[PDB]
Ligand binder design. Structure first.
Ligand SMILES: *c1cc(=O)[nH]c(=O)n1[C@@H]1O[C@H](COP(=O)(O)O)[C@@H](O)[C@H]1F
Ligand SMILES: *c1cc(=O)[nH]c(=O)n1[C@@H]1O[C@H](COP(=O)(O)O)[C@@H](O)[C@H]1F
Lengths: 330, 322
């Protein structure tokens, strides 16, 4: 009755992990230039304490790109591999956050935008991060808010689900839901994949289209949620242990309440806690489901920019779990 | 330092078209080029190697400069890189004299990992050297802090002139895409208004605000944000993606926003009507109606001739409209 790592649908992988660690913390890994630069500076000041810990972890030997470089001594990188120094410290920063925080994470979400601005080098890092998370068996989300015509988006499907072997991604369906047939499904291989579509976002002006536009007294975010679930049903996702879920911001309390009320069993991904100042108690309460994996609370910068990310993660894990307990003991 | 508005106008004066050539090479296109080049003694690669501009690409130039016979024996790990990059150079070399702009869709450059991003960088370098105005089509959207990374990638790293953006999340994101307050830099973008996919009506037309369809609302907000940012005073603009199969919308947008910049994909592979699109979207400054053609050029076995006939037809249609 046992399924091996990598050989099950995302719904099953999330449920198993949720049973294991009893939380809905989603850790965001969005390293910026200052993060990387700082990591390098700190490691140089402390004889690379964290990099040396990274290098003892067994699965570093199972990443795809430039292991030859990643496994070098840090002082050899600095002295002998100058053109690889950035790749090295960027990738080791990522492994460091993962190693420090993974025991608290239901899922990691990596936002593509942070991995592209230096050109190809960050995509090598991103591939290694995904290979590493696959080896640890931690559920993954690639946050890329993708959108195009079907013929174009199948390239993103290949990158996200074949190359990175991601469990899921985020999608903006404003163009249409028909794009989902080329993202959540591969007709050639007959494989199904999971996604979170944008419903209500955290940016301060998100109401401008998501709540102002309507059809017959239903606001755009409700229509968009319904259309996404209609497409999920058509594609048979949940019967293949995948899903289409919703991104609903952690500062959008009324919309979280409406979505959980009107779509009782939907999967919700909620960014906005920490750096963006959303209210965790209100968000988790309004979006609560007794299957906690259906209300992922994403926290990025408030963990990754803390000097002690393991402790920051534990603190959020504990805060979330205390609110989960309040709801279980309602 | 020209500004995209100025780049477009000056190039329009030199080549007298509004053809925008799409460069979206897929795996089959690359494999076909490789196969064909092998069978025809690398005729096009050899032509590529004679062009001056190749000497100015940033990434792995020495690889790109090697003879194909040598690449396949002594740099085999670089074989895909080499043929992918050379396909792009071949298309650009064969068609550039007919292009007001080139538009590269990011999705085609990512699915193999980092390797395609090096190709994409070299492509922007090559176009920059040819001083051809550029668009990165990536339909970006996120919160402000996140999209700054796309501003850097697109406008600092690639040095693109412009990009496409999806503002459904909100318009304020444009402040962190089309503007860099630190450096006092301004950049141009086209925002999604009416798209070519067959179910595009579902949100763009069927949603409304006080009896105006969503696409009109979105277009107006994009121009509102352009005004706020003072783009046009800095020789830049926010414009509209309007499908070349969306005649009513193109008609309405050109009527209601008389001086707007439109990018129109959908001719060729997606069936759109060239005469109707150019007519409904027409402006005397015809750089304001970019007609994008991707696959109908790149998947044509005779791409110079395909580009030539779109150039010629656009020019006949432009004269009809005056
Ligand atoms: C995406 C959608 C949205 O509505 N908000 C939002 O922030 N995003 C992305 O989510 C995370 C937030 O991380 P943080 O904890 O550091 O604020 C980023 O990846 C952002 F791009
Ligand atoms: C983007 C928006 C849109 O409405 N339609 C559309 O096709 N796109 C992108 O535009 C071009 C079309 O190229 P084609 O000439 O090969 O059809 C592609 O880059 C597509 F992604």
């Amino acid at each position: 009755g046992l399924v091996p790592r990598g050989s099950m649908g995302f719904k099953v992988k999330l449920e198993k992990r949720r049973n294991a660690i009893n939380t809905c913390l989603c850790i965001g890994l969005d390293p910026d230039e200052k993060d990387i630069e700082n990591f390098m500076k700190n490691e140089k000041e402390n004889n690379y304490n964290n990099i040396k810990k990274n290098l003892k972890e067994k699965y570093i030997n199972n990443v795809s790109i430039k292991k030859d470089i990643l496994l070098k001594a840090p002082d050899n990188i600095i002295r002998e591999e100058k053109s690889e120094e950035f790749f090295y410290f960027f990738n080791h920063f990522c492994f460091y956050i993962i190693n420090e925080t993974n025991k608290y994470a239901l899922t990691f979400k990596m936002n593509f935008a942070f991995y592209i601005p230096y050109g190809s080098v960050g995509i090598d890092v991103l591939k290694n991060v995904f290979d590493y998370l696959y080896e640890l068996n931690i559920p993954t989300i690639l946050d890329m808010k993708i959108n195009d015509i079907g013929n174009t988006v199948k390239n993103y499907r290949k990158f996200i689900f074949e190359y990175l072997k991601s469990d899921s991604c985020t999608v903006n369906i404003y163009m249409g839901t028909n794009m989902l047939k080329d993202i959540c499904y591969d007709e050639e291989k007959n494989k199904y994949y999971s996604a979170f579509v944008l419903v209500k976002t955290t940016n301060p002006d998100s109401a401008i289209f998501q709540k102002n536009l309507s059809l017959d007294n239903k606001q755009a975010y409700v229509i968009m949620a319904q259309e996404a679930l209609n497409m999920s049903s058509y594609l048979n996702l949940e019967q293949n242990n995948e899903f289409i879920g919703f991104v609903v911001g952690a500062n959008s309390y009324d919309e979280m309440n409406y979505i959980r009320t009107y779509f009782p069993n939907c999967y919700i991904l909620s960014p906005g806690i920490g750096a963006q100042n959303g209210d965790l108690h209100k968000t988790l309460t309004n979006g609560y489901h007794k299957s906690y994996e259906k209300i992922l609370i994403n926290i990025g910068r408030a963990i990754t920019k803390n000097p002690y990310p393991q402790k920051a993660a534990q603190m959020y894990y504990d805060q979330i779990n205390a609110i989960l307990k309040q709801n279980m003991e309602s």
